[PDB]
Design a protein around this motif. Structure first.
Motif, mmCIF file in Angstrom:
data_model
loop_
_atom_site.group_PDB
_atom_site.id
_atom_site.type_symbol
_atom_site.label_atom_id
_atom_site.label_comp_id
_atom_site.label_asym_id
_atom_site.label_seq_id
_atom_site.Cartn_x
_atom_site.Cartn_y
_atom_site.Cartn_z
ATOM 1 N N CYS A 171 0.793 -1.217 0.000
ATOM 2 C CA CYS A 171 0.000 0.000 0.000
ATOM 3 C C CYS A 171 0.834 1.280 0.000
ATOM 4 C CB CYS A 171 -0.861 -0.052 1.231
ATOM 5 S SG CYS A 171 -2.007 1.362 1.259
ATOM 6 N N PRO A 172 0.633 2.206 -0.966
ATOM 7 C CA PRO A 172 1.363 3.437 -0.999
ATOM 8 C C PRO A 172 0.912 4.457 0.082
ATOM 9 C CG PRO A 172 -0.210 3.406 -2.810
ATOM 10 C CD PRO A 172 -0.479 2.213 -1.936
ATOM 11 N N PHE A 173 1.808 5.397 0.362
ATOM 12 C CA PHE A 173 1.669 6.321 1.514
ATOM 13 C C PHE A 173 0.455 7.251 1.397
ATOM 14 C CE2 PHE A 173 4.026 9.092 -1.445
ATOM 15 C CZ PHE A 173 3.563 10.367 -1.141
ATOM 16 N N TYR A 174 0.170 7.700 0.185
ATOM 17 C CA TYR A 174 -0.959 8.599 -0.073
ATOM 18 C C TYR A 174 -2.339 7.901 0.040
ATOM 19 C CZ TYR A 174 -1.368 6.691 -4.925
ATOM 20 O OH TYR A 174 -1.576 5.918 -6.025
ATOM 21 N N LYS A 175 -2.386 6.598 0.342
ATOM 22 C CA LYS A 175 -3.623 5.899 0.763
ATOM 23 C C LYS A 175 -3.748 5.596 2.263
ATOM 24 C CE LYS A 175 -4.588 3.753 -3.809
ATOM 25 N NZ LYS A 175 -6.041 4.103 -4.011
ATOM 26 N N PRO A 229 -2.440 9.031 8.588
ATOM 27 C CA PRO A 229 -1.487 8.947 9.728
ATOM 28 C C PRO A 229 -2.180 9.210 11.048
ATOM 29 C CG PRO A 229 -1.215 11.064 8.580
ATOM 30 C CD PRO A 229 -2.171 10.216 7.740
ATOM 31 N N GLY A 230 -1.860 8.399 12.046
ATOM 32 C CA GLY A 230 -2.377 8.592 13.361
ATOM 33 C C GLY A 230 -3.671 7.885 13.547
ATOM 34 N N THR A 231 -4.028 7.053 12.550
ATOM 35 C CA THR A 231 -5.206 6.224 12.596
ATOM 36 C C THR A 231 -4.858 4.789 12.154
ATOM 37 O OG1 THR A 231 -5.892 6.646 10.281
ATOM 38 C CG2 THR A 231 -6.535 8.332 11.934
ATOM 39 N N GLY A 232 -5.781 3.896 12.398
ATOM 40 C CA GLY A 232 -5.733 2.639 11.687
ATOM 41 C C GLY A 232 -6.492 2.688 10.354
ATOM 42 N N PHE A 233 -6.505 3.816 9.623
ATOM 43 C CA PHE A 233 -7.438 3.845 8.449
ATOM 44 C C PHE A 233 -6.669 3.844 7.152
ATOM 45 C CE2 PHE A 233 -10.356 6.765 11.227
ATOM 46 C CZ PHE A 233 -10.814 5.686 11.936
ATOM 47 N N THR A 234 -7.292 3.233 6.110
ATOM 48 C CA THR A 234 -6.859 3.419 4.718
ATOM 49 C C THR A 234 -8.093 3.915 3.877
ATOM 50 O OG1 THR A 234 -7.279 1.122 4.084
ATOM 51 C CG2 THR A 234 -4.935 1.756 4.791
ATOM 52 N N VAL A 235 -7.709 4.446 2.735
ATOM 53 C CA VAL A 235 -8.734 4.969 1.766
ATOM 54 C C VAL A 235 -8.427 4.328 0.384
ATOM 55 C CG1 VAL A 235 -9.812 6.960 0.645
ATOM 56 C CG2 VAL A 235 -9.014 7.128 3.056
ATOM 57 N N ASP A 236 -9.448 3.633 -0.141
ATOM 58 C CA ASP A 236 -9.411 3.064 -1.525
ATOM 59 C C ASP A 236 -8.170 2.099 -1.728
ATOM 60 O OD1 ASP A 236 -11.747 4.532 -1.739
ATOM 61 O OD2 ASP A 236 -10.823 6.025 -3.163
ATOM 62 N N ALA A 237 -8.005 1.262 -0.714
ATOM 63 C CA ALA A 237 -6.780 0.409 -0.607
ATOM 64 C C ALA A 237 -7.128 -1.104 -0.406
ATOM 65 C CB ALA A 237 -5.925 0.970 0.542
ATOM 66 N N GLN A 266 -6.357 -3.640 -2.858
ATOM 67 C CA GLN A 266 -5.674 -4.492 -3.864
ATOM 68 C C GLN A 266 -4.298 -4.913 -3.359
ATOM 69 O OE1 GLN A 266 -3.748 -2.636 -7.335
ATOM 70 N NE2 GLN A 266 -4.807 -0.755 -6.848
ATOM 71 N N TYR A 267 -4.045 -4.697 -2.072
ATOM 72 C CA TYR A 267 -2.741 -4.895 -1.415
ATOM 73 C C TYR A 267 -2.761 -6.045 -0.378
ATOM 74 C CZ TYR A 267 -2.533 -0.205 -3.448
ATOM 75 O OH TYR A 267 -2.578 0.888 -4.321
ATOM 76 N N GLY A 268 -3.813 -6.857 -0.347
ATOM 77 C CA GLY A 268 -4.012 -7.840 0.726
ATOM 78 C C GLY A 268 -4.372 -7.220 2.058
ATOM 79 N N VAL A 269 -3.950 -7.858 3.136
ATOM 80 C CA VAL A 269 -4.188 -7.361 4.497
ATOM 81 C C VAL A 269 -3.150 -6.262 4.761
ATOM 82 C CG1 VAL A 269 -4.305 -8.068 6.951
ATOM 83 C CG2 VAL A 269 -5.070 -9.618 5.131
ATOM 84 N N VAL A 270 -3.578 -5.010 4.992
ATOM 85 C CA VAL A 270 -2.639 -3.901 5.186
ATOM 86 C C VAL A 270 -2.266 -3.838 6.659
ATOM 87 C CG1 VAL A 270 -2.322 -1.413 4.910
ATOM 88 C CG2 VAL A 270 -3.588 -2.690 3.222
ATOM 89 N N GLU A 271 -0.970 -3.794 7.019
ATOM 90 C CA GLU A 271 -0.612 -3.960 8.456
ATOM 91 C C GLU A 271 -1.056 -2.724 9.214
ATOM 92 N N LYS A 293 -0.847 21.711 3.655
ATOM 93 C CA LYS A 293 -0.149 20.756 2.841
ATOM 94 C C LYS A 293 -1.148 20.071 1.870
ATOM 95 N N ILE A 294 -0.669 19.843 0.629
ATOM 96 C CA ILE A 294 -1.454 19.069 -0.422
ATOM 97 C C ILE A 294 -0.750 17.786 -0.811
ATOM 98 C CG2 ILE A 294 -2.549 19.150 -2.670
ATOM 99 C CD1 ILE A 294 -2.700 22.247 -2.296
ATOM 100 N N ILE A 295 -1.447 16.642 -0.806
ATOM 101 C CA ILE A 295 -0.990 15.354 -1.258
ATOM 102 C C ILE A 295 -1.836 14.969 -2.487
ATOM 103 C CG2 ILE A 295 -0.619 12.888 -0.739
ATOM 104 C CD1 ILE A 295 -0.461 13.816 2.278
ATOM 105 N N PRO A 296 -1.265 15.071 -3.688
ATOM 106 C CA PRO A 296 -2.045 14.546 -4.884
ATOM 107 C C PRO A 296 -2.312 13.094 -4.851
ATOM 108 C CG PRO A 296 0.035 15.613 -5.557
ATOM 109 C CD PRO A 296 0.093 15.527 -4.062
ATOM 110 N N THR A 297 -3.469 12.615 -5.343
ATOM 111 C CA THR A 297 -3.835 11.212 -5.429
ATOM 112 C C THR A 297 -3.933 10.699 -6.897
ATOM 113 O OG1 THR A 297 -6.231 11.547 -5.298
ATOM 114 C CG2 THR A 297 -5.042 11.319 -3.148
ATOM 115 N N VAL A 298 -3.742 11.571 -7.868
ATOM 116 C CA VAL A 298 -3.827 11.210 -9.306
ATOM 117 C C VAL A 298 -2.670 11.842 -10.055
ATOM 118 C CG1 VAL A 298 -5.364 11.090 -11.393
ATOM 119 C CG2 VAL A 298 -6.408 11.231 -9.073
#
Ligand code: NI
Length: 341
Positions: A2-6, A9-17, A19-24, A312-317
């Motif tokens: 899973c890439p960093f922009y998905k 931080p500071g949560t157990g959360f991912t977004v739109d992730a 396709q990476y199996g179980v994310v640690e 701060k801005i993090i692009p996703t596309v």
């Protein structure tokens, strides 16, 4: 992996992730919307908690068969606590069920993840008005000034006037509209409403539309193709060969096809006005490409970000090339220097 922009931080959360199996470390997987690049990996065997809108959860259950016990739908515009963290879902003005997610982190940071969105001035009066955003995870699909296109209302006006003129001239013309995902339903609904018809389609597409909470949908669509003079077909069939093949199946009811291909932006937007758009024609078949976007233009994106004033801005596309990354970073700095944040 899973890439960093998905990751949030500071949560157990991912977004739109998915396709990476179980994310640690991931305790809750958010899904912004039901488009395949974003749900890539979900299926009936998924066994972790998925958070989403009601409409996205209807599609997960009926189309992908995810079990009910793992689907967690949240209402919009409502503060909700998930695994001990305050979140809000906001309408993204993308496809049906698509959301942006506001995360209120335990340390006081506020993060907005846009998912996919088409920015609009009406978002300046949502729950975003009330507080500051430190980090913006931004849908940068059209982050360059060449990407211009008209409003969705202008595009729909063109489609309705074009279809009503053609079928009034020739009552034996069929209208066909391409589709390959959810979104852009107003194209075929607005044309069928001006013609006085239901929209005809496959069982598979009917099923999908039945998940979308569109008011009075039973009055607007059908699987009885013979009763309808607006048909939906897969986008891949919207060419002279596929349309010829379709007209044969219609039992001599029709002697002409008028077809629409909703695209996103195309380079003919750099020269031609919507009003001046012409079709490609072969014999009794004409095909219009119409620039109906469900993503921000450059100017709509810039207005939204200049209003929000993120730290701060993090692009996703467009994140895969150095050139794309450098281009986007230059525009973010111009915007910030021009507006003074
Ligand atoms: Ni999308």
């Amino acid at each position: 992996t899973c890439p960093f922009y998905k990751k949030i931080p500071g949560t157990g959360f991912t977004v739109d992730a998915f396709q990476y199996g179980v994310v640690e470390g991931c305790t809750a997987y958010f899904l912004t919307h039901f488009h395949s690049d974003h749900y890539a990996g979900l299926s009936k065997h998924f066994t972790f908690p998925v958070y989403c809108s009601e409409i996205t959860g209807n599609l997960l259950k009926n189309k992908l068969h995810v079990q009910e016990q793992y689907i967690h739908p949240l209402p919009l515009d409502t503060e909700c606590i998930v695994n001990g963290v305050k979140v809000v879902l906001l309408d993204a003005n993308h496809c049906p069920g698509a959301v942006m997610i506001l995360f209120y982190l335990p340390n006081g940071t506020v993060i907005l993840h846009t998912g996919d969105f088409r920015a609009d001035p009406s978002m300046e009066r949502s729950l975003l008005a009330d507080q500051k955003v430190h980090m913006l995870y931004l849908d940068t699909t059209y982050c360059s000034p060449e990407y211009t296109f008209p409003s969705q209302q202008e595009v729909i006006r063109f489609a309705i006037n074009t279809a009503f003129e053609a079928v009034t001239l020739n009552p034996h013309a069929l209208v066909v509209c391409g589709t390959y995902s959810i979104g852009k339903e107003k194209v075929f609904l607005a044309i069928a409403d001006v013609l006085g018809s239901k929209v005809g389609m496959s069982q598979e597409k009917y099923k999908t539309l039945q998940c979308l909470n569109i008011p009075e949908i039973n009055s607007l669509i059908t699987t009885d193709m013979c009763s309808s003079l607006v048909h939906l077909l897969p986008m891949m069939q919207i060419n002279f060969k596929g349309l010829q093949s379709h007209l044969k199946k219609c039992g001599g009811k029709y002697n002409q096809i008028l077809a629409f291909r909703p695209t996103g932006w195309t380079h003919s937007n750099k020269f031609t006005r919507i009003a001046d758009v012409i079709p490609q024609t072969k014999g009794n078949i004409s095909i219009y490409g119409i620039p109906y976007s469900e993503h921000s233009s450059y100017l709509e994106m810039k207005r939204f970000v200049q209003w929000l004033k993120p730290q701060k801005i993090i692009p996703t596309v467009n994140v895969g090339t150095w050139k794309s990354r450098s281009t986007m970073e230059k525009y973010f700095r111009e915007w910030k220097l021009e507006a003074g944040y």
